[PDB]
């Protein structure tokens, strides 16, 4: 009986480690001997250690992920796609935890429950990727949504943080209601909630005889809810406001982690929910609109975080290009784009957090950065060019292969929109590089040097971005392996 | 045995060495940059000597895997057409270094480093036999030249000229990239030796030719897109103009000779 | 004689929101926001840069009706910045931007009313 739980040690470990960290923090924060120590950095380091140990548990136990698959069949399904998605998710969480260490000291964020809630959200997303049922997917989505609602309003005294948390909670609850109504309408029309059953019942009757109103409506509502979750327009109701008002270490996590898991869910819904290519049209329109709106909205931004939010929306549209073209080479392009975008976003948010110790708010603030810190300016310019998609950098490979996938299915209209949006994006990305190097402001802002964690993260990510084209084979190999394993 | 690998790695080592040298040692930076440029030029001259002039096959071929299924890979080779372009693009760099000798105390290491990266990226352009990677190194030159035009410009107009050059180059680049993608999907590979032995349908030849012309005509200004060249030429350092007039204007002609015409 | 700092000293009357009138000192040639920063009426960490694009009307001031004719007219950028941050998308018709008002020796005794503070941390 104990060996049936060999498939859930990575989750059991992280759950128990979160419990131990919570007990440790609550016991020793409210202590008289140690004069109420602000043990946020301690809990952060121990949580990073826990993440690394559960990464070791999950990665090493690769043959054991299919163990007791019949017993766990109704609960979750673990396969090669889940394995790599979960490993990438743990890596991103560890990177975010590493970045947010300096936030706890200079700004004096002494609340240790931030790390505990991050770990609980990580557990929710681990259960999300392997979820093979509507019920499990909904529960994991709600768990991570609550863990994010709580930490979005962590800055209680801040006007922006409270409003951002309120807007985030309202939007997320509305999206969850729409998704949940879609799930109810699907369950009431087919009588099944498991993905295997829901694939066997829908794969044959491909609207050949008539269009099932209930099934079509449920599919549409689930798609709409998921589109709210990833903030693809016109379902970006308050996403820029949430990104701006949220704390920067918090904004770093929501910009990366909630996207990997939700995209995994959308893929595991496409494996069965391809009902008459209905989602392919919805994602087609959503991707075009997302690229256009992100490109046309990030040029009218003077703040760094709003520009990052609109960049995230544009890259979500670029990724949804892969959804619109349903093929192995489309899903592979989608996953490569997700990986590259996550790494670039981690790079950019580490750079922003490095300058956040001096309260950077506007693009003009980073005006004379090429004179005071002439290597941080180079790193930020590299990240901006990678966002733009300049050929020599790693950001070009994702857009290249996504455009190739789009042209494979024969959608020539998507390619033209992507090209125009790429031109606009490159313009407003090199606009930032103009400020750092070419302008000569009268007043300069001097920043204090960053710490070791963010310096190492920036160095590694910048070496990845510039030198990815030389050795891109492993990423393509693992991505092609994941895309094929979605069905066999 | 002198091959194309060493000729490309010499500027790489030259740029890496200067990357980690203190800026106070101005003499050492200039000496090492000039020595690297001269060594690269001598390497090119030696490559000329051992060049067979009786075979149409590409010589000194080198391969390095890029995609996991060897669909597209780093294929480097020279022929009687691109040999002199390589020699010229390695000869011009030491002259550019020597131009800014007196004033180098103000530019710093980022000047010689930018020129060495330029040389590394332009040697690979004339040596690539893969259509897609020829585009990758074709439009990687923008970043070093963008930095050269903007950081070390003459007046405040340097921002406008850099924007115009970059925007025109992007407009050509992506419209050519779409054609490259269409060729890759249909043919199956992007190797020049395979693309030169594939019978393209008559209808697709005009569209692909126009798309290739869009990117190349900008870099060899015909008539309607010759309005960026004068502004970029005037708003550039003395050595920067040599690169734009000596090499960057030879990309369009070489692109027409190597890909479009066959 | 010689060049005195007092030769470019602009005397101003700044009223903080609770109706107290205190006399601030500025330099002719620098922005009025800089003059307000010297005493501490406006937090220097909120408007560290005297630039239009690095501004969200954190330097908003209320100039007197009779003291507004001796100033350059509001530019398009100033109006655009003023409208968005008004929280009501309305124009007060007498509110200027601190970073866009350059002090001058003809502005001796200009009465300026500083409105209430607004959040700027993130």
């Amino acid at each position: 009986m104990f060996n049936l739980f060999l498939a859930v040690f990575p989750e059991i470990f992280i759950i128990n480690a979160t419990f131990i960290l919570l007990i440790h923090g609550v016991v020793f924060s409210t202590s008289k001997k140690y004069d109420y120590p602000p043990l946020a950095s301690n809990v952060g380091w121990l949580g990073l250690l826990s993440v690394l140990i559960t990464l070791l548990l999950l990665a090493a136990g690769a043959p054991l992920l299919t163990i007791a698959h019949l017993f766990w069949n109704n609960l979750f399904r673990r396969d090669n796609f889940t394995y790599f998605c979960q490993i990438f998710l743990l890596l991103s969480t560890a990177g975010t935890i590493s970045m947010c260490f300096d936030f706890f000291d200079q700004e004096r964020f002494d609340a240790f429950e931030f790390i505990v809630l991050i770990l609980l959200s990580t557990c929710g997303m681990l259960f999300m990727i392997s979820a093979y049922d509507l019920i499990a997917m909904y529960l994991a989505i709600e768990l991570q949504s609550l863990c994010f609602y709580v930490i979005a309003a962590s800055k209680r005294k801040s006007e922006f943080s409270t409003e951002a948390g309120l807007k985030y909670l309202i939007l997320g609850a509305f999206s969850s209601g729409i998704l949940l109504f879609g799930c109810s309408m699907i369950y009431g029309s087919t009588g099944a909630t498991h993905f295997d059953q829901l694939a066997k019942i829908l794969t044959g009757y491909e609207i050949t005889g008539a269009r099932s109103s209930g099934i079509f409506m449920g599919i549409l509502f689930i798609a709409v809810g998921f589109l709210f979750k990833i903030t693809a327009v016109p379902f970006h109701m308050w996403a820029p406001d949430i990104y701006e008002g949220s704390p920067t270490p918090v904004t770093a996590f929501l910009s990366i982690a909630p996207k990997i898991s939700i995209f995994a869910n959308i893929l595991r819904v496409f494996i069965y929910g391809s009902y008459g290519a209905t989602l392919q049209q919805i994602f087609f329109f959503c991707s075009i609109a997302s690229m256009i709106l992100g490109a046309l909205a990030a040029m009218a931004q003077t703040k760094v975080k709003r520009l990052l939010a609109y960049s995230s929306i544009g890259h979500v549209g670029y990724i949804c290009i892969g959804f619109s073209c349903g093929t192995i080479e489309g899903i592979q392009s989608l996953l490569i784009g997700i990986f590259i975008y996550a790494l670039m976003t981690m790079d950019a948010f580490a750079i922003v957090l490095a300058l956040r110790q001096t309260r950077v708010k506007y693009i003009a603030d980073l005006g004379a950065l090429a004179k005071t810190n002439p290597i941080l300016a180079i790193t930020f310019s590299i990240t901006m060019f990678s966002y733009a998609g300049i050929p020599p950098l790693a950001g070009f490979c994702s857009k290249f292969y996504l455009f190739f996938a789009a042209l494979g299915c024969g959608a020539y209209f998507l390619a033209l929109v992507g090209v125009v949006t790429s031109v606009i994006g490159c313009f407003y990305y090199i606009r930032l590089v103009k400020r750092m190097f070419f302008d000569t402001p009268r007043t300069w802002i001097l920043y204090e040097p960053m710490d070791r964690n963010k310096s190492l993260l920036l160095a590694m990510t910048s070496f990845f971005i510039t030198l990815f084209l030389l050795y891109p084979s492993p990423l393509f190999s693992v991505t092609h392996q994941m895309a094929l394993s979605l069905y066999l | 045995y002198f091959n194309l690998s060493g000729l490309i790695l010499c500027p790489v080592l030259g740029s890496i060495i200067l990357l980690f040298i203190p800026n106070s040692r101005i003499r050492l930076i200039r000496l090492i940059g000039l020595c690297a440029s001269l060594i690269t030029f001598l390497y090119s001259l030696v490559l000329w000597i051992q060049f067979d002039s009786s075979t149409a096959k590409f010589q000194f071929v080198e391969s390095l895997r890029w995609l996991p299924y060897e669909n597209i890979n780093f294929y480097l080779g020279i022929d009687g057409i691109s040999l002199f372009f390589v020699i010229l693009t390695t000869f011009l760099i030491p002259i550019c270094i020597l131009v800014g000798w007196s004033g180098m105390r103000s530019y710093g290491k980022e000047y010689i480093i930018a020129f060495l990266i330029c040389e590394f990226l332009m040697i690979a352009v004339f040596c690539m036999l893969d259509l897609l990677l020829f585009y990758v190194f074709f439009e990687s030159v923008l970043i070093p030249m963008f930095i050269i035009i903007g950081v070390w410009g003459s007046r405040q107009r340097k921002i406008k000229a850099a924007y115009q050059f970059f925007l025109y180059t992007l407009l050509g680049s992506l419209f050519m990239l779409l054609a490259i993608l269409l060729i890759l999907f249909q043919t199956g590979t992007t190797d020049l030796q395979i693309l030169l032995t594939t019978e393209f349908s008559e209808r697709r030849q005009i569209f692909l030719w126009i798309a290739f012309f869009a990117s190349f005509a900008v870099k060899v200004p015909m008539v309607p897109v010759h309005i960026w060249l004068p502004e970029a030429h005037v708003e550039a350092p003395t050595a920067g103009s040599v690169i734009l007039a000596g090499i960057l204007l030879k990309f369009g002609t070489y692109g027409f000779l190597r890909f479009s015409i066959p | 004689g010689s060049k005195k700092v007092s030769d470019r000293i602009v005397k101003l009357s700044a009223i903080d929101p609770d109706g107290y009138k205190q006399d601030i000192i500025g330099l002719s040639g620098q922005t009025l926001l800089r003059a307000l920063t010297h005493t501490g009426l406006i937090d220097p960490a909120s408007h560290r840069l005297d630039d239009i694009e690095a501004c969200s009307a954190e330097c908003e001031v209320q100039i007197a009706e009779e003291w507004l004719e001796k100033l350059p007219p509001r530019t398009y950028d100033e109006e655009y910045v003023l409208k968005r941050s008004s929280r009501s998308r309305i124009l007060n018709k007498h509110s200027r931007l601190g970073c866009q008002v350059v002090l001058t020796q003809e502005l001796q005794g200009m009465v300026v009313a500083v409105p209430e503070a607004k959040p700027w941390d993130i």
Binding site: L296, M299, A300 | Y168 | Y80, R84
Partner: peptide, 26 residues
């Protein structure tokens, strides 16, 4: 050059994106 080629070019009239990007607040 300075006329039709510029007005129909990238900045004579293609700078309407300033009158187009700023409208995205709607």
């Amino acid at each position: 050059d300075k006329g039709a080629i510029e007005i129909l070019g990238p900045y004579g009239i293609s700078y309407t994106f300033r009158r187009l990007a700023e409208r995205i607040s709607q």
